[PDB]
Design a protein around this nucleic acid. Structure first.
Lengths: 122, 24, 115, 116, 212
RNA sequence: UUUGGCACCUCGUCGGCUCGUCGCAUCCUGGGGCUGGAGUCGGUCCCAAGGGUUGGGCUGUUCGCCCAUUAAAGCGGUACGCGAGCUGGGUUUAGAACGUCGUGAGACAGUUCGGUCCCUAUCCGCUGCGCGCGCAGGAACAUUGAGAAGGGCUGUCCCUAGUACGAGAGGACCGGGACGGACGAACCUCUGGUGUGCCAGUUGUUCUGCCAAGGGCAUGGCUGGUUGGCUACGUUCGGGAGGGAUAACCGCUGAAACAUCUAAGCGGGAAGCCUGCUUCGAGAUGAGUGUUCCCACCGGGUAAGGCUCCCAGUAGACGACUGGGUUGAUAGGCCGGAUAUGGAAGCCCAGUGAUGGGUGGAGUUGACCGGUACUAACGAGGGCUU
RNA sequence: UCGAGAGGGAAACAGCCCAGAGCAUCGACUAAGGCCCCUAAGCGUACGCUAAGUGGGAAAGGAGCCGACAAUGUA
RNA sequence: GAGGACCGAACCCACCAGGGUUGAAAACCUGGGGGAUGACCUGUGGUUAGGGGUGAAAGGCCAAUCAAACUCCGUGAU
């Protein structure tokens, strides 16, 4: 569960490192976002010379969460850190490389390019 | 708070009747 | 009055599972089902807890994949994994290995139990 | 034995343990004590468990009883006089009898004694 | 509309796994066997309904008025009675046994029972009121209701306003619970969800009131 | 609902939070007329108050601007609702300073830093719970429903279809599915939380004669776990469909006098109204209905059946409700399990020692489960008239 | 007129309509106002108008009607 | 091995918060907080008295009372 004023590590190479969650999309008053939920965030820390500069307002998809998430089969998955991937307006990732594992919840939500680029999907 | 009026004799005695002991 | 509850909690029970403990490295053969084709994903990691009762037993497996500590909690009797392979044994002195969340690298390794 | 709901006897959890431990001391010393009804009800399961441990009699159990009754003399009588008496009886080692309310605070009293 | 019903007794909850390997948390209901003891009708009693008597009680704890009411239908005295308000009560017969397997897998039921008690619940726990914040200097009102009305107009607390009172222990009916499995040997019902009332309570299971 | 005038009652202003409640002059959702309405979307107007109406930056702020969303971020009344409910930031005390005015004490709808917010609920009111009596015989059980309360929110994607519409760009009505947001209820199988209960490690000190093993205190000394219970961040479920009458509006037949939706009549027509769903419900004094039981005695004893007392929880502030009371598994204890911790004590072996290995998934162990009696279990004799 | 004025009427309503209380009265006639029931006395007699519950609130203006429209609950 | 030096108990004080508010207390309690070798704190004995005292200055303090103490008297003021 990631909410407003939450900070996420960026898992791709767009040049951003840390983003602050501005809002959770998909409903009025929506409170928490998990794996596969799209959010609006601001870039709080970025690599010098990268594409995205500190202060930019971006949309990012959450790919890891520290709060364990239940699956249909009864099993759960959790990670050690909260991470997201910055998207373009068309729903495609801005970066070209993705670091660390990602959750399988992306498949049903049609983030196929995220998955194809991810080193491992658990 | 404070009692607004002196309680009427009827109302006072309605209540004290409830303060009775039970036969053992 | 749960006298007859265990009768219903003795049909869904699994028997393939081995007898492992917390601190024992295992290899779970999860059965991923991507629509048409279903492969068998392999999850190798330490067993940091095992809690519950009867049909509700759940164990947790932990691994570090590309510098990220992933955890997966499975029901011991869930018809999701083909088989559980007890790889090694642990020499831990606890029952909930929750102190492995912050330890990283050489310090966060469980020692084999040489008999 | 199962813990108590609500307020602990004697005003604290720490006082309760030592309170029930010493009441058991007196019950084994004299075989019968008169005390408040609530205290008697709490004391029954504690004393009955101690007798169960004394029945077994081995050195290990003697440590375990000593964790509650620090008095070695009382424990000696427990293992050598009382436990042999109840060798055959399976539980229900104590008898609780209600008596009249106490003067002064109108606390309901009761007698708890070892079953002969 | 036709409504089949049977009394049960919630036994606990467990989980199962449907063929698609989806954990399905079920509650075990020991429904049956229960017998019809009286059939009401339009003429005799005004409406259409059917009593069913479920339970186990030795004949020594039943008083004579009930002991003679059971002997009219020629059934051993049970302990709990209820009526199912149906529309086809003329198809039943005194003494008929309603087994556990009146329902089959997939059907949706409307379970009913006495919800768990909660004592004299406070304002927040019983109506989800908010508080006045732990910090920033709140004087002994961290969990108070707040206000309860306006000033001189109307100069009165509206009826039906939400206060703190005894919570729970009242009749509750959960709806469209799915009957996962019906184990006809023991006479159980694996129902996907959470039926009201504590373990050992007397639940009632009747067909879906809605969707018919 | 503003700024005002009168001076008729009475010698903490504001803002925020909590909790409502009402109006419609409607922000969304629902229905419709016209359109300078090709389609998607709009403009205006008519009907419509059932529900819904987010989170932040600045400022005491209402207001206002802005950011990110949303189907939408409505306007108002209620002592500019609500301080015997909370705050006390501005504002109306005493301290001090700046600008200006004053010769001065001081003053300023100028500014600045600081500045005590009391109360045990008598009455009405509201939320729950009992006692008494009533309901013409006395009881046990189950219910009809006059009335009342609760709920009424909504999005995205797929098919229909890249179809009708169009220069094309774009792009439907209607109809059918899939998954969600917010809110509410029940529950504890799963996931998390607590744990003065349980298990283990360890610090200082003190005690049990000493070693060993343990107790007391130190926030449960601290720390690592944690069954039951209570829980939400967790699981499951709900908003509905349908029927009746309607608003705006759309019509059939049709005059008064060809035309007319109307003057007689007959239809369609809203998230709105009544039902349907959930719950309470015969003190509904209009006190109802059903099955069964007792039986026609002499102020009193009784029948059916209750109450008191005790053990408890499925209950609970106390009453109350539910089950059990030797014909007894109600509680405790005792046997076993499941859970929880995690390898007891003694002895042996290894080691100079701290320690390690074996005996042994050991010992301890509560609430969950199965067995087991060992302990404790006042109230009828039917009024009269037709 | 009240102030300093009782009594009857206007539902209640010091100042409006009728009427100025020395005291008693289980008699009668009237004033303002009324006469279907609440509530005393007319469902009065006869002619005509109103179809809007107008009567039981209101304008410019439009063809008795529309204009007509706020907040606790008919009001 | 100096210091109107540093940290910090006793001692002196009273910046913040909560409680208390017909209180345990007519000004306190609990947890934080400032000084803590100095212009410091404190005991005992003296001394300054009302348009007067004293005041590192708030109209502060002068017996729970101070923009002029308290008591008796003018006095049954107005």
């Amino acid at each position: 569960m990631i909410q407003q004023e939450s900070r996420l590590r960026v898992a791709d190479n767009t040049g951003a490192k840390e983003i602050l969650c501005i809002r959770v999309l998909g409903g009025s008053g929506r409170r928490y976002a998990g794996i596969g939920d799209v959010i609006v965030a601001t870039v709080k820390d970025a690599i010098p010379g990268g594409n995205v500069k500190k202060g930019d307002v971006v949309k990012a998809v959450i790919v890891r969460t520290v709060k364990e998430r239940r699956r249909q089969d009864g099993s759960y998955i959790r990670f050690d850190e909260n991470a997201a991937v910055i998207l373009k307006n068309d729903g495609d990732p801005r970066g070209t490389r993705i670091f660390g594992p990602v959750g399988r919840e992306l498949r049903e939500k049609k983030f196929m390019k995220i998955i194809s680029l991810a080193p491992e999907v658990l | 708070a404070v009692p607004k009026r002196k309680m009427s004799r009827s109302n006072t005695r309605h209540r004290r009747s409830q303060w009775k002991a039970a036969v053992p | 009055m749960s006298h007859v509850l265990d009768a219903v909690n003795a049909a869904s029970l699994r028997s393939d599972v081995p007898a492992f403990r917390p601190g024992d490295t295992v290899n779970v053969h999860v059965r991923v089902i991507e629509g048409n084709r279903s492969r068998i994903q392999q999850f190798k990691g330490v067993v940091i807890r095992r809690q519950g009762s009867g049909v509700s037993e759940t164990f947790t497996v932990r691994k570090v994949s590309f510098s990220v500590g992933v955890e997966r909690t499975f029901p011991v009797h869930s018809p999701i994994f083909e088989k559980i392979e007890l790889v090694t044994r642990g020499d831990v002195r606890r029952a909930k290995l929750y102190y492995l969340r912050e330890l990283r690298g050489k310090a966060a390794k469980i020692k084999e139990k040489r008999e | 034995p199962k813990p108590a709901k609500g307020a602990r006897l004697g005003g604290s959890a720490a006082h309760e343990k030592l309170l029930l431990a010493n009441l058991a001391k007196s019950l084994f010393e004299h075989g019968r004590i008169t005390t408040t009804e609530a205290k008697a009800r709490r004391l029954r399961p504690v004393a009955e468990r101690l007798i169960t441990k004394a029945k077994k009699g081995d050195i290990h159990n003697r440590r375990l009883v000593l964790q509650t009754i620090t008095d070695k003399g009382i424990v000696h009588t427990l293992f050598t006089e009382i436990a042999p008496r109840y060798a055959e009886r399976p539980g229900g080692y104590t008898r609780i009898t209600k008596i009249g309310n106490r003067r002064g605070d109108n606390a309901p009293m009761a007698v708890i004694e070892l079953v002969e | 509309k036709n409504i089949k019903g049977v009394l049960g007794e919630k036994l606990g909850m467990t989980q199962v796994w449907d063929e698609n390997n989806r954990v399905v948390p079920v509650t075990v209901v020991k429904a049956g066997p229960c017998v019809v003891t009286q059939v009401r009708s339009n003429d005799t009693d005004g409406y259409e309904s059917v009593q069913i008597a479920f339970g186990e009680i030795d004949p020594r704890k039943v008083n004579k008025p009930l002991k003679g009411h059971f002997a009219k239908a020629d059934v051993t005295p049970r302990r709990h009675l209820v009526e199912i308000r149906t529309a086809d009560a003329s198809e039943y017969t005194l003494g008929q046994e309603i087994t556990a397997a009146v329902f089959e897998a997939g059907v949706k039921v409307d379970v009913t029972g006495k919800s768990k008690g909660k004592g004299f619940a406070g304002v927040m726990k019983r109506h989800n009121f908010r508080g006045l914040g732990a910090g920033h200097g709140t004087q002994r009102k961290h969990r108070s209701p707040g206000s309860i009305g306006g000033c001189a107009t109307p100069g009165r607390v509206f009826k039906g306003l939400r206060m703190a009172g005894r919570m729970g222990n009242e009749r509750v009916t959960t709806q469209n619970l799915t009957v996962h499995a019906v184990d006809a040997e023991k006479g159980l019902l694996l129902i996907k969800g959470a039926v009201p009332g504590p373990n050992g309570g007397l639940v009632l299971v009747r067909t879906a009131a809605k969707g018919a």
